[model samples]
Target chain A: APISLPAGTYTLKNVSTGTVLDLWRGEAAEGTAIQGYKSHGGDNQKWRLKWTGKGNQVTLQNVKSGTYVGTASNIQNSVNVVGSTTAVPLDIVAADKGFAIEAADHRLFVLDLKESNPANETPVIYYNNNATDNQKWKFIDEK
Target chain B: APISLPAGTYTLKNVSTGTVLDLWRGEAAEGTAIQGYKSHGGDNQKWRLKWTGKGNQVTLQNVKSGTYVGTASNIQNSVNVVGSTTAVPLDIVAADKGFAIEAADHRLFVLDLKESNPANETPVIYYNNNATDNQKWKFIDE
Candidate 1:
């Protein structure tokens, strides 16, 4: 399902860690895990959402590499950049502060950042019903 | 050299034909001549300019294929989308009505539409000291 969202480049910043979600090392290869990194205006740091017709199944592409971000293993697994759109899609849930992201699988586990320190560290998915600040992400548009 | 211009997409409309600049057949090949066509929201129709750090020598990339718009025969010649940034660049000059484009060969030519009937006919570079409507092009942000 497609959600009504703006079509532009944005920096998905983790509200709790003060770190931004980014592609590791600006790699253009598939299965490149998205990590938490300090802000830098690299193409890997910039993400553009491509609306999928399915409900909330939006595919996020890196502005520099033009690759899609998806999960490697599935729900509760690590997220990475894939060449194709055949993986665990995302459900952008609108929240009070920012937005909560959930994998559009049966489990539908919320995308969370467990570690706050050490930029470029991989983020993990967690099963938390309560929306924590770690699960909340701020979509800052790039100028 | 690179010319500094505000980074945005512009609809390169031909004043003579009242048609917008577009990629021929929406082709992503190198040396593909850019032509004037009716307005359609195609990726080949949207071109993004990337500054090359040289004064006013920016590379225009087609939004659909991510290729640079350049020339095969250099100045006083046809322009097309190339694979690399190793060709004649464009200098975007501001005009009273719209914009006047110039090539790097010291020929202060403007992008002109010679044939006005068929929309897909290729445009040519014309030497124009005056900003006529056919020489003056409005860069509508499409």
Candidate 2:
């Protein structure tokens, strides 16, 4: 399903713990894993959401690394979305608590947190959509 | 020379007249001739200047037209530049009194107002670099 969130900077916060999506340890590396962390409000935690000018497609760029966040380019049927400097697109669809993101080019997998874990440092991954709480996230407008 | 003008929105005003660059009659069509008019402060007069991330290369998009301003693609070795929807690169260089825009790929011409005229609707064109007051324009930080 296509969903439109007003384009702006935002923090993808897990509904249960309110911890936002984070770039692991403020790393500027090309393949850094995205993790969940208690929000202290840093650029690494901020995602600049820009509609790709396509139907329900958006590019989420980390302000700190200045890179796109999407599934790792190496793995087909991968389970993780890593920080990549190259341009990639994601589809944001309506989900349980807030929204769900699916690799627009990669079918099936949607962003998920491990077993609805509320603890910080829960790694971000993708799995077949089960409509679980971990697969859901709320966008907190940062700008 | 690649010059950096802190990336932002601005109005290109003529140094001599202070009348800013305007999209003719606020039209949103391709090939519309850019005009000189007194600033009434409209989006048609506002240009979103973005650095192309290449040395000294930039793209200027009119807020109203959402088009690139450059020489007509239909006319090779054209003297006049018109609004183009296609992406184009322009080289901005420091000129006497202000800055001047030159087609990055088109040589021998710099944007000029014909014969240094100050009247409204004086068509904008690129004649060989003469550094005249009409050819020179100041960037108004808007």
Candidate 3:
């Protein structure tokens, strides 16, 4: 199952040991393993990719209630859905997952949860889009 | 004409712009573009490759220097030498021109520069060592 994600750097922590997974955002490719390292929110640590509903607005799954007012929609996914109903929808697109990564932006594109090796899938990252409609995402608050 | 490197994340920063080409270490294959990124010097960024010094100790070149280190030292000739010293001799191997990345006490088997690509060599992120010696690197620190 895909781990819940918020737009930011996250540590796949060993809840018991408190050891964080060394997850890094590679400029080269997706599915880059989150190695072991001290937790710091670096771009190498940040994951990008927005989730949007099939139409455009987010739903309950992507956005949380009472947290986001109306809806928090953007082309980026994993945003915090707390205390507001402004939610950003989350969805995955695996077909058009190829393009040249611009050096100027240097954003890490998340792979589609379904297309990616299921066994190797974790919340480390998802597919990315640079301000495109398909790339636009919504966050829904579950709690 | 190559930079000697140790097992660590070395940033290849532009001398003037300070813009990094990226980080590279072990198993640096040929034709791989030595790129940089916003890093905090983690093990994933660090590499451990044998040097050309005929010994175990390797040399690290500051990417902030003017010169650029490229993959496939012999093929595309992307890496340039522009440091104080033009000789990087950490380990003496065959005509190999890529560096090895080592971290967490294990010789990192793969050091890919990007996340996903159609082909592996579109850039470079070294992998298993074959007899090709493409994994063997000899960086020139200028």
Candidate 4:
């Protein structure tokens, strides 16, 4: 069974690269793409995980943008951090590395680090079968 | 004493055009602008007026989008519905016609029928002084 997500602001840190999820240019504009970056303690980097009370799924909302994180197409082979006005359901499944952020779509894989380069950090979905550190994430509560 | 705004969903009907505040295309997407149209009872037409505990001010948020009603620039000029993660405060002042939605930016006014064409509805801001029907609005609890 998956642990229920708490309702609070948190910073999602990638277990492997030690980077955190971030909005491009720290912009709150709708449709802004999300990426991976070092924690700057900025509101843009802070995400409020709101539990939808449906199963163990939660909506990851950018504290600054107030937009939920989800892909344009809820399916495999399509991975991009897009802001949505409606709450996007993400299933939080426990994993050995940390936890996998699964999309509401069963066919879609969890969010993983596509480009580990410190200069250019990008997030995408690879394959659920392969358990890589990139697919693992740890949630740090923001006080 | 000012009228205390309850925390609940309400519909803002414009006095001039007799139309209700509505979200464009009922889109919950960020940057989705607001307009005036006939009431359809959709979540997009419902607004959650949240009291800020600061004198007669409250933040108007769309029930569906969960975004606060704001303006492009908090200045003394035209107003277009803008959305932000943070709540945008508006003064709920009592008016003979009904009530005036004043922006936190003292100079900015709220609620206006842009274009004045019922076929093509648009929500905008007018001058603060003139208490025209266009500038006046009444809140109907949903």
Candidate 5:
């Protein structure tokens, strides 16, 4: 069973679009922006931990990614980062990795991917142990 | 009605996402990779063109948005870009200097905001004109 940690500012980079900090967690009640460089840390970054399945399978939500950034950033500020279909793998530190960042589905399962390829070759998630700029993530504010 | 032109490069930017060229199109078939590039001019940078109806509706797909630069340039050598929604309007050139770009119904729109919002300040289909950078689009090739 992977350790379920509280949700915070975790920036995930998309390999294809070069979109940075595309996802983040927002305020709890108001669902305000909590992740990213703009806003400060808060409960919004904290997860309402809950176990839905029998085998440590947990359901998580309320996490928010930052808005898109580019020349059009000023014009379209409401463009929120939608979840992607792809899944990232994590190491034994289950608390660190194993989930989709900006997947099209917005959510994914960890055990499913982990079991699908026990060999652990296909990364359903991973840790930023290697700070090669690819894994450097931070849970900041949105404001 | 705006005039149609041959296949070439163009930029598709999302006013909402601030994510420009998040979607790309190319002459190749669907299911292909949508290449990515830092903003630049190149042949692979071009896109195909076709009119939907009244020359107002149009379809735009991703193509190589020119050669990739930086350290990531030598990764695979494949043209990177993403598939876009579609655009519909006439005389894309006449619209806001062709600053129109959006996605609706899964098909990306390479539009002229000026034309799409001619009256209602909403969106409408239009034709492609290779006169300005707004009309020029590229996909997020990968």
Candidate 6:
């Protein structure tokens, strides 16, 4: 009866490429950007979506790095997503076959796969939501 | 920064047709199905979206009829929407150029304009969510 996705650890997969979200090279650094990597059930590819109980908002925490995913507070336009110690609240809306992950800091800007690339190291960034496959994500819940 | 649309009276416009939702023939009785009608800013064309504070759920009440809109319990498919004295909780999600209103009685089914027709009296019903303009609704605040 709710509009938000249930809180859980799910491998975030892109609608276009079916690639999972992974820390670049599985780095534990606080500001390491995420990349699209082949999923082998690695912890780096799994994000724990935890609801903050505030208006359909949730934080994406990497299971491997324990860092949150989001853009710099004021940065805009194809900005790279990095891991942060503090939770970066994100608002989500259900879409066609997936969910649109919008950042709280940037209204209407959502998690985007840069140019819809299919490379293994495709960087995921905050971009304008076009409701396209490249901008939408599917949460594969294994629970 | 809230995910839900601001609460107030708004004209619900169909994305594909640019027509606003209106009670069919401006009927005052309950159970009058909504139809896509040309914008005239009539009371029947205006709806008050009130938040219910339950997981992004809101009630769509027609300004003219003063009745809430939703599907009958356990009813499914292209079902006609109607007015009722009671509140009908509806879930909403932001979509492409508008919002997708999901009836509580049916999962994954959203407020839809069957066949995306623009003809007057085109009945608006609940259909599967496709993220298409036909299924999405824009809240015209002006």
Give the number of the best model, judged by TM-score.
6
DockQ of 1: 0.01
Candidate 4 lDDT over residue span B1-142, tens digit each: 1122345688887767778788776665666777788878888888887656453356889887888776666546455665655666775543444456766456246556665434435765544535566776677765
Which segments of model 5 are wrong by more than 4 Å? A1-143, B1-29, B33-36, B61-81, B84-98, B104-142
The lDDT of model 5 is: 0.26
Better model by lDDT: candidate 2 vs candidate 4? 2
Instruction: Compute each candidate's TM-score over C-alphas.
Output: 0.44, 0.46, 0.18, 0.45, 0.21, 0.54
Show where candidate 3 strays beyond 4 Å.
Answer: A1-143, B1-61, B65-104, B108-123, B131-134
For the candidates in turn, chain A alone yields TM-scores of 0.79, 0.86, 0.25, 0.84, 0.26, 0.90
User: What is the DockQ score, from 0 to 1, of model 3?
Assistant: 0.01
DockQ of each: 0.01, 0.01, 0.01, 0.01, 0.01, 0.06
lDDT of each: 0.57, 0.67, 0.27, 0.64, 0.26, 0.72
True contacts kept of 3: 0.00
Model 6: runs farther than 4 Å from truth? A1-4, B1-91, B94-142
Task: Name the candidate, 5 or 6, with the larger TM-score value.
Answer: 6
Q: Total clashes, candidate 5?
A: 76
Candidate 2 interface RMSD after superposing interface residues: 21.2
For model 6, the local distance difference test gives 0.72
After TM-score superposition, what is the CA distance of residue B55 in candidate 2 from its true location, in Å?
48
Q: What would the C-alpha RMSD of candidate 5 be, to one decimal place?
A: 19.9
TM-score between predicted and true chain B, model 4: 0.84
Candidate 6, what DockQ?
0.06
DockQ-based class of model 6: incorrect
For candidate 6 chain B, the 10 contiguous residues with the lowest summed lDDT are B1-10
Tell me the deviation in Å of residue B83 in model 4: 55
RMSD of each: 19.3, 14.3, 19.2, 19.0, 19.9, 14.6
Give candidate 2 regions above 4 Å deviation: A1-4, A73-78, B1-142
lDDT of 6 at A109: 82
Per-residue lDDT for A28 in model 2? 69
